[PDB]
Write a protein that binds this ligand. Structure first.
Ligand SMILES: [Zn+2]
Ligand SMILES: [Zn+2]
Ligand SMILES: [Zn+2]
Ligand SMILES: [Zn+2]
Ligand SMILES: [Zn+2]
Ligand SMILES: [Zn+2]
Lengths: 64, 64
């Protein structure tokens, strides 16, 4: 049940937005994140994509 | 074309939210405002309601 590329990338983007806008609702936070991720190119998402692949390998190996 | 009670009340509530959350989109800003206003009771909206009535009078008198 590891995080996918988006979750991996969002984890940091979320804190930066939430630890700055106490009034910014979570639902909207998720919506902004959803769209910013979409606007990104593969070249910009690549590292988050590789990290999700790394995490998936460890899970499938049962976390040695 | 004077502001109604909501606009009158929002004018201040908007600046306080926008001059604090550069990342908070306008569409969402309007949505939050729309709902907070709704949650308010007449007793809390009264002064903004009176101001809108004052403004309407001046307009109907053609702004003397
Ligand atoms: Zn909201
Ligand atoms: Zn790869
Ligand atoms: Zn696992
Ligand atoms: Zn938005
Ligand atoms: Zn009155
Ligand atoms: Zn007028």
């Amino acid at each position: 049940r590891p995080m996918n590329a988006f979750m991996v990338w969002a984890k940091d983007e979320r804190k930066r937005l939430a630890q700055q806008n106490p009034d910014l609702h979570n639902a909207e936070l998720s919506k902004m994140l959803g769209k910013s991720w979409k606007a990104l190119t593969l070249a910009e998402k690549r590292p988050f994509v590789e990290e999700a692949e790394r995490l998936r390998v460890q899970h499938m190996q049962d976390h040695p």
